[PDB]
Design a protein around this nucleic acid. Structure first.
Ligand SMILES: [Cl-]
Ligand SMILES: [Cl-]
Ligand code: NA
Length: 312
DNA sequence: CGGCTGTACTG
DNA sequence: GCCG
């Protein structure tokens, strides 16, 4: 990580682009920043800069200004709105467009939002849990959340598999949120469970707010019982057994891992989703058999990677 | 020039 | 932003 002196300046620029909705430029910055964060030695030569994949002409030119001047002149033309747009867009359910609208309307603080903004149902929940949603949890707590869902689900059928995915499954010490993936080996007994499970978890007082209720995926808010507990983001997903491996892969991530794998599948005339690895349409396309995650890797001509190896 | 992943909610 |  011999990077700090350059990346710190780039991240400021990156975040500005992000919160103002210039997602593609922010992507380039993210990737560039990630590369610098993983190069063996500190960057010295302009040519050395280009030498790195993810860093090109313009990023090189910028890195050179940092190494020399110790300051990047672009960081001075960042709209003063940025901190407020970040503040506003950290409300779950409010993105760049909402943040900008609120800013235009003269709002500057969460007090302004609370007292004067018209909030969607999701945004009101997001504001209520503003601080909690910015907090990570120790992985031990993710374990408890998993078991809470598992115990509730297994009440309906002891054969149900319940797996917490995301950074938890990638073996991280802390987790931003928990995704519990649920299926049944017999390809059938997963049906019916979804709505009953949610209602059970709600009656138990575990689910405190619902954000999105989809057909097979729920997004909401949970809190474990007892003192000193925070509200945590929880998704619960139910999939037929045939999708298990692709869903494990997707819900495990990371984000960059997922997009890279999808990009690779596309180069090979395939398409990869949380549902299946398919032949490209580029009729509709054929679902390729993938009973395990290894199968997805092999079909893409990749050696298997354990969840901890997918933390990109 | 233009893709940069592919999915599924809300209202 | 990067890159084919
Ligand atoms: Cl542009
Ligand atoms: Cl595992
Ligand atoms: Na948000």
């Amino acid at each position: 990580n011999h990077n700090l002196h350059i990346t710190e300046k780039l991240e400021v620029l990156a975040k500005a682009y992000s919160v103002q909705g210039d997602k593609w430029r922010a992507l380039g910055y993210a990737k560039a920043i990630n590369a610098l964060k993983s190069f063996h030695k500190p960057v010295t030569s302009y040519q050395e800069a280009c030498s790195i994949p993810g860093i090109g002409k313009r990023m090189a030119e910028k890195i050179i200004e940092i190494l020399e001047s110790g300051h990047l002149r672009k960081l001075d033309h960042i709209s003063e709105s940025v901190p407020v747009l970040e503040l506003f867009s950290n409300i779950w359910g409010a993105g760049t467009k909402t943040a900008q609208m609120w800013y235009q309307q003269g709002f500057r603080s969460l007090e302004d939002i609370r007292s004067q903004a018209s909030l969607t149902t999701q945004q009101a929940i997001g504001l209520k849990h503003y601080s909690d949603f910015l907090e990570r949890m120790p992985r031990e707590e993710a374990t408890e959340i998993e078991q809470t869902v598992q115990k509730a689900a297994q009440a309906f059928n002891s054969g149900l598999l319940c797996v917490a995915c995301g950074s938890y499954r990638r073996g991280k010490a802390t987790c931003g949120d928990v995704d519990v993936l649920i299926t049944h080996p017999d390809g059938r007994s997963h049906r019916g469970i979804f709505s009953r499970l949610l209602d059970s978890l709600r009656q138990e007082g575990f689910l405190t707010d619902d954000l999105v209720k989809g057909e097979t995926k729920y997004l909401g808010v949970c809190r474990l019982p007892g003192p000193g507990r925070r509200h945590r983001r929880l998704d619960i997903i139910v999939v037929p057994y045939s999708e298990f491996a692709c869903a494990l892969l997707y819900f495990t991530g990371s984000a960059h891992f997922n997009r890279s794998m999808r990009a690779l599948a596309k180069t090979k005339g395939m398409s990869l989703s949380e549902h299946a690895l398919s032949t490209a349409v580029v009729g509709p396309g054929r679902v390729l058999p993938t009973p395990t995650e290894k199968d997805v890797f092999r079909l893409l001509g990749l050696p298997y990677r354990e969840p901890a190896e997918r933390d990109w």
